[PDB]
Design a protein around this ligand. Structure first.
Ligand SMILES: [Cl-]
Ligand SMILES: [Cl-]
Lengths: 665, 665
């Protein structure tokens, strides 16, 4: 209604005297470390419940309908997961059975340590692509060709199918172990803010580039062409050019089958997504298309007659655990860090989505610890890095999922598909498995439709999307992520280095101050010039602050004093022979400052000293308490620059200046 | 005196209606490029006067009194320049002849393009070290030994004295040209803010740690030992151990003569600095100690009898210009970027010190063009990077310097020191030249005494000093600078990601709001809870802003709503069978925000949505004009979240709630 106040002009000291402060808490490092480590059993029970969240949702079960919901979601997600594993095994350059291994053990491990309920841990296209890329870069194909086979002219250096897969599997296991170790280190040290740097446009561009690279790789697999494992800089462009040059050496049957299953899967997925109000349970198009592909490929001998590319390499059994070949961490530390951070980011995103959809809370450090333990347990069983795919996750959420029991049942399907089932998947073409991956790329290919929206929105974030998407295409995929985080941090620094300063003026008959470049009927005080500077002054925006002051006052405090001294020597010689007109004061509305960066408080003191020589006072308006306490420690309040120069509000400074002008002409 | 106002509670819309805004300026890209490139004669005269600042101080000269002070300082700095110029050549692994070339040619170029008056362009101890650091790594000593000389058992692979320097001289010329091009790029593209990242603790710790590497490198010449040109990681640590292991192979003639001039040059310099009130002109101790060193070394045959290390390699002549060996810019691009930025940082640092004392403004972007053409012109005559030493600069200013005429006269002394003079410096020991460099290291060795001062001051800046000083010792000197720039920028992100939020309360009978953790007698409104959050919300601190709200209200907006649904299902079944207590509203005092980072502004709409379900209003207090216009573009003002939720001041949000509850119970 009515906003009326009546108080004296407390600038800095008229308010600090009669206001008793609170005594700061003593450090007492001994008592701090003693009180932190609790001795009562309450803290022990709390940390046990937090570290192992399985003991929370188990006692409060609702078996009656939860049993049926979990068993149906488990069989469905198990089918989907074994299909996605046998499909993504090609993205990691590992055999097909190791994908099923990586789709089984992580599920068992993410049961006594996970803190989620609607997450299906397993393979992931982007993570498997990164694993395969680093495996190809660390163990390429031109390092295994053994000369044997009595060739025509030279030594018969044919393909090394065999012991090469063992080396690739050992390398993938070492990479997974290193990723798990990095995740456990990030979880135990309670460092979780490191993944907050992955903004929405950054991860969007990263996923778009990863989807492009996955499309290129799966197109190489479908066409049944052999490239030269180009890796490094412009690897995707080079391999795409090599594919375009090797179009003649394709397989017509494999290409036709792949295109047909792509069209079928895309049409079925679009029909199920659009007309959702008629069929709530998503039709498992992957399962039926894989069954019909295995049925058609088994009838006619596509391997012999049509020379198709089938798997025919399923051993259908387990294997004893193999110790990882430790010693390759120095040359893969950055790759493992990138894989771990992207896996944790995707996992946290999916968890937060399916938690705010079902109204429950998911911890971050617990998810980090759970995924670290899962990757460590997977490294001991010849598996690659595990994550949660959004397509596989939606299955248990749509079909009905309450706890992780549906996830444990999803491993029973993989369990029976490892020991007994799998012989029927022998004549399955690799082009069919390479198609469902492309069909799942529709969710990430449509992410490019946000650039026009982000451009109308904050433009600095729209550039981060395009920068991350392009930079993660030229120089690899893992190196492109590091180039995005640094670019995002540089963009943040540039937004606090080049602020939006204004010409704050006074609204008539009130005390509210608005910018002069946005409103017209604003009257500024006679002689006084007000200035606001956001983005607190640090070592980078000191020259920017100087230029802002020089532009808002019209002149320079240095050149005016130089001209005054040049005109003063003409006065001291005349006795022997015989600019700063409008600016009366400068009220700096430094209300949007947080830190001071003492290198900047030196410049502030220099400004106050320079303007004092030209008879121009530099007052402050909205200096915070934590900022004044910092400036006082940095040696700013000398015998001449007292606290009376600072004020509490913007109108207090103007009122004090008007009263001083009225009382002193 | 009296601060009294009487205005209605204009929140956001009661102020926006009757306040007509100013129309934004039209882009008009066709006219923007036309109005920028002016055609009048004033634009042509302005670009020539700024690019060539010689046409300013030359017409208004004071030959009557200025020429007398420049001829005495020119011959004074010429003797100091010809000694420091040839002494710094040892740090660049180039012969002593090319050291005088770097003190004559850069002066001629820094006469028509320079924008300063008290700067003596020439070599520099830190800059020459970075130049010689890459010469040892690109052309090491074990890459030129030629087997010849009928050795004892194996081929006589003795030293390559002779054509070995030709590979080092041509390498320094290519490095000099690449540094000059980068400086012209920064000057041509008008990008000068890149050197603002070199903060005072960053450049302070870099020059301090560089003084250690100069001390270790010059100690090798004093002791006259032969190391193994260790470069890379821990280069200074490895070469220091090798010196201690080779103490037995020292030279008592070079050590005693080297340690003697260390004490003499340090004592006279310290005595002259303290007792300045008796002798205004600094005594050239560096000059008198070199002449007496050559006289003693010429009398007794120190080369033959005492086996001392002398130069005896001064041809005393010029050379035709040699074209730079283009093709080495790819492997020296990362090294030249670190040298081109320190050659400009020290130039502006030393320039501005002697500019505020003589009261003349030095152009910023012109120094990039000035030293740019200087290094380019120096590359065509077999020189290294040119800079301005603080020790050599203080000579021309203390003895009397007005313009660059004293610098040109200083080049005449170096001019005669090449054609005629120079034969007398033949028996000069290398330990004497390697000692005057160590004596000047006192200015940088005493910079360690600021770490205790910076610790009592802003502690984040004291860590950057120690980080830069240590990191520039482990991994080289040029790589340590880049590790400091990224660490300094990272500290700015850490200060804006972890802000200093408070519990702002109300002062009785007034309208000023202060933090509750600093003052005691502060009354908060009944039910209303105020929160202030500096360091504007971006993608990194968006999660910390959630934890900040959860801590100031006591509860969580998510878990409380989850318990409400857990308690609501018991209500919908009872009809079939038969927390948020204190927090009334939330006033976010977002007055210290500058940008939005729409990635983070989506959570602001989520926070209002999360608190609206629990019947808690989330109001805003001090949102700026440039931020509210950004919220509308990012899709924040929907049909439910209107502008009435925002307020102009903090007390308007409290006054609105007190009247709303009074009128609506
Ligand atoms: Cl997916
Ligand atoms: Cl010096």
């Amino acid at each position: 209604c009515s906003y009326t106040v009546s108080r004296p002009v407390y600038s800095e000291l008229a308010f600090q005297q009669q206001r008793e402060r609170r005594l700061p808490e003593r450090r007492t490092l001994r008592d701090s470390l003693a009180r932190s480590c609790s001795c009562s059993r309450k803290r022990a029970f709390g940390v046990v419940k937090t570290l192992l969240p399985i003991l929370d949702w188990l006692p409060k079960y609702r078996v009656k309908e939860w049993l049926l919901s979990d068993i149906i979601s488990g069989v469905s997600t198990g089918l989907v997961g074994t299909l996605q594993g046998m499909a993504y095994a090609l993205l990691a350059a590992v055999p097909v059975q190791f994908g099923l291994y990586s789709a089984f053990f992580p599920i068992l491990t993410y049961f006594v340590f996970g803190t989620s309920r609607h997450i299906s841990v397993g393979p992931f296209p982007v993570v498997s692509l990164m694993v395969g890329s680093v495996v190809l870069s660390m163990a390429p194909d031109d390092h295994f060709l053994v000369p044997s086979g009595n060739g025509s002219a030279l030594n018969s250096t044919t393909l090394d199918t065999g012991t090469r897969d063992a080396a690739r599997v050992l390398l993938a296991s070492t990479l997974t172990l290193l990723v798990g170790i990095i995740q456990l280190v990030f979880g135990g040290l309670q460092i979780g803010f490191i993944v907050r740097y992955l903004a929405d446009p950054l991860v969007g561009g990263f996923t778009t580039a990863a989807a492009f690279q996955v499309l290129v790789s799966q197109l190489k697999i479908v066409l049944n062409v052999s490239t030269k494992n180009y890796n490094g800089i412009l690897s995707i462009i080079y391999t795409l050019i090599e594919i375009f040059q090797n179009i003649g050496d394709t397989n017509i049957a494999d290409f036709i089958a792949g295109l047909l299953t792509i069209i079928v899967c895309m049409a079925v997925k679009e029909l199920n997504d659009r007309f959702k109000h008629r069929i709530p349970v998503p039709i498992p198009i992957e399962v039926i298309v894989t069954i019909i592909a295995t049925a058609i490929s088994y009838g006619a001998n596509l391997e012999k007659n049509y020379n198709a590319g089938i798997v025919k390499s399923i051993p259908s059994g387990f294997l004893p655990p193999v110790l990882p070949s430790v010693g390759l961490f120095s040359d893969m530390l950055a790759a493992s860090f990138s894989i771990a951070v992207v896996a944790y980011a995707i996992a946290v995103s999916v968890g937060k989505v399916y938690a705010t959809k079902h109204d429950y809370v998911i911890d971050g450090n617990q998810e980090f610890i759970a995924f670290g333990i899962s990757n460590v347990f997977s490294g001991f069983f010849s598996c690659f890095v595990a994550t949660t795919a959004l397509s596989r996750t939606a299955v248990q959420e749509s079909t009905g999922g309450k706890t992780q029991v549906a996830g444990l049942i999803s491993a029973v399907i993989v369990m029976v598909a490892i020991v007994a089932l799998g012989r029927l998947l022998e004549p399955l073409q690799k082009s069919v498995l390479a198609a469902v991956v492309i069909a799942n790329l529709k969710g990430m290919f449509m992410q490019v439709c946000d650039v026009p929206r982000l451009w109308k929105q904050n433009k600095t974030d729209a550039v981060i999307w395009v920068f991350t998407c392009i930079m993660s295409i030229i120089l690899g995929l893992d190196l492109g992520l590091l180039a995005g985080l640094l670019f995002a941090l540089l963009t943040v620094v540039l937004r606090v280095q080049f602020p939006s300063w204004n010409g704050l003026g006074s609204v008539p008959s009130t005390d509210i101050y608005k910018s002069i470049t946005h409103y017209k009927n604003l009257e500024e005080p006679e002689g006084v010039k007000i200035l606001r500077f956001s983005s607190p002054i640090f070592y980078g925006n000191v020259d920017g602050f100087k230029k802002c002051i020089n532009s808002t006052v019209g002149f320079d405090a240095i050149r005016v004093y130089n001209k005054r001294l040049k005109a003063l020597r003409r006065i001291q010689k005349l006795i022997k022979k015989g600019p700063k007109v409008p600016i009366h004061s400068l009220v700096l509305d430094c209300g949007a400052v947080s830190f001071l960066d003492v290198v900047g408080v030196r410049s502030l003191r220099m400004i106050v000293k320079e303007f004092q020589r030209i008879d121009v006072n530099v007052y402050f308006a909205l200096l915070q308490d934590d900022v004044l306490e910092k400036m006082e420690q940095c040696g700013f309040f000398d015998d001449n620059i007292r606290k009376d120069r600072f004020f509490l509000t913007v109108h207090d400074a103007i009122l004090h200046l008007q009263n001083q002008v009225k009382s002193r002409e």
